[PDB]
């Protein structure tokens, strides 16, 4: 979706469930984002 040919920028809305299966995958995605930023 987001690309260099978009002058409207983008709006990213991520729907996360409340405290059931969401916290683990979200925390793992945050740690994975930290590892990707460190790489």
């Amino acid at each position: 979706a987001h690309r260099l040919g978009q002058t409207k920028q983008v709006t990213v809305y991520r729907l996360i469930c409340k405290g059931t299966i969401e916290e683990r995958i979200l925390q793992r995605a945050k740690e994975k984002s930290e590892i990707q930023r460190m790489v």
Binding site: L4, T7, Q9, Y13, R14, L15, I16
Partner: protein
């Protein structure tokens, strides 16, 4: 390894740096619109 990842990542990062090309969008952000994400 895990605990040795400081020296292994220090030598492996600069050792594998010549064989890879790392580019960031911050340099191309001049003609690129701002990006943002909001979790709900």
């Amino acid at each position: 390894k895990s605990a040795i990842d400081e020296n292994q990542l220090s030598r492996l990062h600069m050792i594998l740096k010549p064989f890879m090309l790392r580019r960031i969008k911050k340099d191309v952000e001049n003609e690129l619109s701002d990006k943002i994400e909001i979790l709900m």
